[PDB]
From a paper:
Influenza A viruses infect both avian and mammalian species through binding of HA to sialic acid (Neu5Ac) moieties on the surface of host cells, and viral host specificity is determined by both viral HA structure and the type of host receptor. Herein, we report the antigenic properties, receptor-binding specificities, and crystal structures of hemagglutinins of three different H5N1 clades responsible for recent fatal human infections in geographically distinct areas: A/Egypt/N03072/2010 (Egypt10, clade 2.2.1), A/Hubei/1/2010 (Hubei10, clade 2.3.2.1) and A/Anhui/1/2005 (Anhui05, clade 2.3.4). The overall structures of the three H5 HAs are similar to that of Viet04, comprising a trimer of HA0 protomers, each with a globular head containing the receptor-binding site (RBS), a vestigial esterase domain, and a membrane-proximal domain with its distinctive, central helical stalk and HA1/HA2 cleavage site. Highly conserved residues (Tyr91, Trp149, His179, and Tyr191) formed the base of the sialic acid binding pocket, surrounded by three highly-conserved structural elements: a 190-helix, a 220-loop, and a 130-loop.
Furthermore, N-carbohydrates were observed attached to the conserved Asn154 in the HA2 of both Hubei10 and Anhui05. N-carbohydrates attached to Asn154 of Viet04 and Anhui05 mask the vicinal Sb-equivalent antigenic structures from immune recognition and represent an additional factor affecting antigenic variation among these viruses. Anhui05 and Hubei10 displayed more straight-forward two-way patterns wherein 8-fold or greater reduction in cross-reactivity was measured. While Anhui05 and Hubei10 both bound to α2–3 glycans in a comparable, but weaker profile to Viet04, Egypt10 revealed a much-reduced binding profile to α2–3 glycans, with the strongest signals coming from sulfated (#5–8) and fucosylated (#30–34) α2–3 sialosides. The weaker binding signals observed for 6SLNLN-b in the microarrays can be explained by the higher dissociation rates (1.6×−2.5×) compared to 3SLNLN-b. Asp94Asn (present in Anhui05, Egypt10, Hubei10) and Met227Ile (present in Hubei10) are both located at a distance from the RBS and have been implicated in enhanced receptor specificity for α2–6 sialosides and enhanced viral infectivity of Viet04 in mammalian cells. Thus, despite these HAs having a number of changes that were previously reported to increase viral attachment to human-type receptors, the combinations of these changes in Anhui05, Hubei10 and Egypt10 do not appear to increase binding to human-type (α2–6) sialic acid linkages under these experimental conditions.
Numbering used by the authors:
A (entry chain B), B (entry chain B), C (entry chain B): 10 to 173
D (entry chain A), E (entry chain A), F (entry chain A): -1 to 321
Write the structure that this text describes.
Amino acid sequence: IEGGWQGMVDGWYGYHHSNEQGSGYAADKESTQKAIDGVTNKVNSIIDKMNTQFEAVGREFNNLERRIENLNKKMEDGFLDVWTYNAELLVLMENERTLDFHDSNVKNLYDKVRLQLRDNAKELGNGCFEFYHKCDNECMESVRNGTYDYPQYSEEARLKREEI
Amino acid sequence: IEGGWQGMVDGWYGYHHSNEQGSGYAADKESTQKAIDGVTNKVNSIIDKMNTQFEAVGREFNNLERRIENLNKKMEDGFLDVWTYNAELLVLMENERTLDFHDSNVKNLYDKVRLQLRDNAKELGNGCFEFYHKCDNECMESVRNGTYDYPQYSEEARLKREEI
Amino acid sequence: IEGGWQGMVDGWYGYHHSNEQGSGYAADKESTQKAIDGVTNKVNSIIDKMNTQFEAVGREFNNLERRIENLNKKMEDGFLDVWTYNAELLVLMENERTLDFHDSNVKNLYDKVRLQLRDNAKELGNGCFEFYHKCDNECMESVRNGTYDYPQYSEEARLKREEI
Amino acid sequence: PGDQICIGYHANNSTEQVDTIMEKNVTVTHAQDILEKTHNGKLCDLDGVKPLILRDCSVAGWLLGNPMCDEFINVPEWSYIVEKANPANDLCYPGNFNDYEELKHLLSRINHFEKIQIIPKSSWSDHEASSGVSSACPYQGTPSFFRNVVWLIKKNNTYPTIKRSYNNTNQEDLLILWGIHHSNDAAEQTKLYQNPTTYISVGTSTLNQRLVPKIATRSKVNGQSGRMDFFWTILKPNDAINFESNGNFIAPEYAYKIVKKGDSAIVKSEVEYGNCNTKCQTPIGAINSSMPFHNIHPLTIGECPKYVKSNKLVLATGLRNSP
Amino acid sequence: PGDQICIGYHANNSTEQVDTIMEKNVTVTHAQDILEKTHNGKLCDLDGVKPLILRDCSVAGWLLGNPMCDEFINVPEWSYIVEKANPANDLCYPGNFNDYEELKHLLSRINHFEKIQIIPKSSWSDHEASSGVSSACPYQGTPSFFRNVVWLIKKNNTYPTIKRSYNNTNQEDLLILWGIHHSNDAAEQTKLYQNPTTYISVGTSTLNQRLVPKIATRSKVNGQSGRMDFFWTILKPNDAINFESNGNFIAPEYAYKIVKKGDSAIVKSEVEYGNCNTKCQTPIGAINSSMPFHNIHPLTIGECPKYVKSNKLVLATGLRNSP
Amino acid sequence: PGDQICIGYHANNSTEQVDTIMEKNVTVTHAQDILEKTHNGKLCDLDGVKPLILRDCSVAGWLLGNPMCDEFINVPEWSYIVEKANPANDLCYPGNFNDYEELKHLLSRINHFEKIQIIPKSSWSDHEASSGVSSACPYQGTPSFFRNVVWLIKKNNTYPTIKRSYNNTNQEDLLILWGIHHSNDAAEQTKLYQNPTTYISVGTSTLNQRLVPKIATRSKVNGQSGRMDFFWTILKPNDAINFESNGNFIAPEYAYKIVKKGDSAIVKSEVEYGNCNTKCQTPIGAINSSMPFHNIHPLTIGECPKYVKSNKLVLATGLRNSP
Ligand SMILES: *[C@@H]1O[C@H](CO)[C@@H](O)[C@H](O)[C@H]1NC(C)=O
Ligand SMILES: *[C@@H]1O[C@H](CO)[C@@H](O)[C@H](O)[C@H]1NC(C)=O
Ligand SMILES: *[C@@H]1O[C@H](CO)[C@@H](O)[C@H](O)[C@H]1NC(C)=O
Ligand SMILES: *[C@H]1O[C@H](CO)[C@@H](O)[C@H](O)[C@H]1NC(C)=O
Ligand SMILES: *[C@H]1O[C@H](CO)[C@@H](O)[C@H](O)[C@H]1NC(C)=O
Ligand SMILES: *[C@H]1O[C@H](CO)[C@@H](O)[C@H](O)[C@H]1NC(C)=O
């Protein structure tokens, strides 16, 4: 949310923890995959649906066939205008959807975490949670894979909240 | 969120409660309606905007009119390509919007509820809330129609939280 | 969420506070700006991409050139149908995106605030927060510009929660 | 435990799939196919109006009265015209039909004719009309010739100069057709027509032609080395048409009044009639449907869904439905 | 109670509605109409350049100098040309204007002419030029004839063979027009021209024609049984054009130099001029606007918004605004 | 402090920008250009099949055997044909090539010819074949003439009437070409041909022409006041073609068998060959790419991306990447 992780080389979306055991990055396997599967077929669908073109031609006319020639010319400009127009608005529209597709997926990671540790952590309002409790590497792995036990740190979180 | 309710025949979106009085499904009238009104006119708008076509024709040419004939042929392939292309990308794009339209509407139901019972229930992270308190059928009806009284169960919720 | 502020003349999105010092409206400068920058270039992109047209013509045919004339006529109806179709579906699709663009931006303001004052305020479920604490004009300015200090009102909020 | 409420959505056993720009083959709860794919395999009426089936006859064979096209001697009103790709009964003498395709296209805004006798066959007192016959044009084995058009020849050894004219006394455009016979050599020319140098001269307010027979040696088409070209014009309400010739003239007897002018086309079907109805017809069959698209056939006629070359157009209406 | 802050959005009294794929007639706070719907109902200049209004004259009437078209004897530069649907002053003798529509289309890239005398009317010493006149072509009641073209006839009883040629000494293509008179019978032919068998023969580097008059009986158009066909060619800078004839020749006097070549068309308006300006003009009126679309008229000319057949194109810019 | 976990996303040093309906120039992490912009600047084979480069020769110059086109006396199979915009070696006598563009278009479905001797040059026993020569048509300075076609003239003072015919004994359509010489005056006519009034008469099952030379005075094109028109037809498998003339006939010697019929066109390039390969070729160069779009040149040939007139088509695939 404050920007991207220059340091996350492992994937498109993921985590960054810091604790007494140190720090580290960790990409989400499922989320990054889902995004690539989605984005790539988007590209292909745009490319593959274009299967239309096969034949190609110019065309030749004499001096007493200027109406027909102009008719031919306007047919080509006609379809060119339409096809230019489509491709450009296809890209703009779809590029936008791609970009907030990523925003939506990042938000989903943030929410999966926020649900697992309600009052066990402080929402810093920055993309990060300040855990109330001590969260060792295994506690951190646990919040990443969904397999995080809330009640273990329950009163610890409550009691160290109550320090404030 | 874990999947759809094979058991909800009453509508598109809704609820499932379980309490001491037993269990049951219950569809949201407003939400299901809004979705049908929206989705149906989407379909019609796609269909009705097509009002364009009226006349129809082939066309016939002799052996010394092959340039014109080819010109005619390419006009038809030309418009066919464009119209095929549009209809297919119209469907893909719009089918996607339809699908996460439904996701968005479901999320709205989940949020209407979550706001009414902050700490009176546990977000299981599964689409369901485990009420702290006892929630009789009328308490349940109350959370469905927005007319739910939070302060009644306030300290009950607090006190039975404090059991943990 | 209950509707728009007839009283907010300062911008597109913003706030309304009420406290012991009275009441007032206040638009978000950044948010309103971002929306105008976005919406206006949307309009221009639609308009500017149309750069296609330059030349213009009818065309004239005799009585023994009815095939060609009809061919010319169908080319014009052909491109007219396509261009009519595009412009209309461009507007519908894009007008929809514009409208929930605004909904999304409003939601972002609501969330920026909700993160800053978790249990220092009650979510009324209406777009408004009932502060637990007393929030003077400067406390209010503080929640608008992000520069709001949560811990100041911490136990005040807790202690006056505990009145319930 | 504790009481629970859940937020959820519809599911069913539906197997209808649907596509998306990012996802293919997504099972859905409710959907609408909009692509129409079925047709009744038959040629049908349009809006209670039967079409005009020339069976093995072509438009020229029909209008000039080829002897094998007699079933179309006096047809009634029609919605469209169906012709085969290679009708066996076209011209019976080899030759050109001038501006054929333009004539054909004109029958696409026409709905009904009225065959009128324009200059009777029994008026040709000084020329031999009834010998307007040849083996190239069979009828019932016997040598015959077009019925709507007279092949005049000399009486005694004399082809006097023909000068006839017709004032369209009606309020409808009428379609007149005539022809010219290109003979093979000077001898045939003299034996048929007497005069060695000849011309057909036809005039309206708009038309001013003069046709001279091309006397030459040719390859036999249908065992016939001769040729015969035909021509046509529209004669407006109060205009008159003038003919003049001293040889090789294939004079008209019957013309066609145009009533009425509407929508039509000329379908190239082999399919048979089926006593059905439709507002949309294709060469390979009618379609009684209601959908924005189809993929039946390009060449469609009437008010018909947009022909498209997709195999599938299905709109998701309901919800993602995986078990 | 307790203090409150709220998140909200703009509202107003605006009643502008806007559409969506899922919702129709949605009231909005701010919007932009992009469909242009208004025009000034007049024919105007383009970019400070007036058009060429032939009022009741046609392009042929104008170029051949029909006596009722005198106001166009020496026009100046123009932006486009406006003609009525059925000009009363076209040809004055009935007949064909060969490749008319191609000529017409050529005036669509032309902007200005310069009428040049190409072979003077007083050069025809051995033929009677001044009797090139007829009742079919009135002027001021009196029998007249095209001004830009001479209808030569015999002097004494003699139409000697004409042999004249013109070498375009200029650097511009020039447009030359000539004609042929189809007489009615042998008698008229002899009385006008003397020689019974005649021809017009015209040649450039690209052109090689030979026209023979079709002597026949016709229906009277404008009380005139005769006919008169016209022809035209472009004569490139250093090319010469050769004429030869011994009868029925409608010789040129004036030709048209082409300067300059630009954009134009030929509008079929009945609307009058209005002393206005535009970069976009239609047959039913000019439009001074700035919008990506319009629904005024298909046949538009200049740089004009995309003609569309919608009644409404309005983009929502602001917010949903219900009270 | 306390332990922390954060949700975040990829960033890099990528500078590839991408556009959106609401935002322009948005830096992204990964992207795909789909618009192809590069070409090899050369003319290449298609699918291992070389094209047919007539260098300074035109299609007519080639088919009629203009003396400077000898390198194309017996070409082999080809993928497409490349011609310059203004070939220096076209006709060598000024004149019309009838239905040229239709002939040209026919070579667009043809892939290979087989030049056949159809009526030998040494068969003309009673006419002077070898004097079929002129200064208007140089060869190696010397006065020559088309090689594939004979300009017959009188032997002694006699042009007897020619009557020759050819029965296509093959299973392929063959392309035959002949011509007519328009002389300048009665004197030239007599000196070349003897007979003052003449005709060429050509007939197939489908064709029935009769050409009469237009004897007139003309402007000298290439120092030559005469003209020469050419003609062509397709002769179906078992059809015969008949020629008859008593003057001004430019007879055929060689015809062209058509084998085979496939895809082709006629490119107007100045670019030279490059010994390359492609499935997509343009006039200004080949393109070996794989992308849904390009902006190289409109007139493209083969299976080629959609020509578009955009400068940029780039799809964002990755994430917003600002430092
Ligand atoms: C998370 O731990 C669970 C068990 O609690 C395990 O199955 C899973 O593999 C772990 N995730 C990763 C990414 O290793
Ligand atoms: C919910 O109860 C309210 C009153 O508290 C009532 O007006 C409403 O009808 C109830 N909802 C349903 C679905 O019956
Ligand atoms: C909000 O206050 C901050 C300092 O706390 C200040 O920099 C900012 O200008 C204030 N916002 C407004 C809108 O005045
Ligand atoms: C018959 O048509 C002629 C055209 O030749 C027209 O002038 C005339 O009015 C018609 N006949 C009569 C008697 O009016
Ligand atoms: C006049 O045009 C002729 C074409 O006949 C051209 O050859 C010649 O150069 C021009 N006249 C002169 C004197 O050069
Ligand atoms: C040669 O072609 C003719 C057409 O004139 C055809 O009838 C004939 O069958 C062919 N020759 C022979 C001997 O069959």
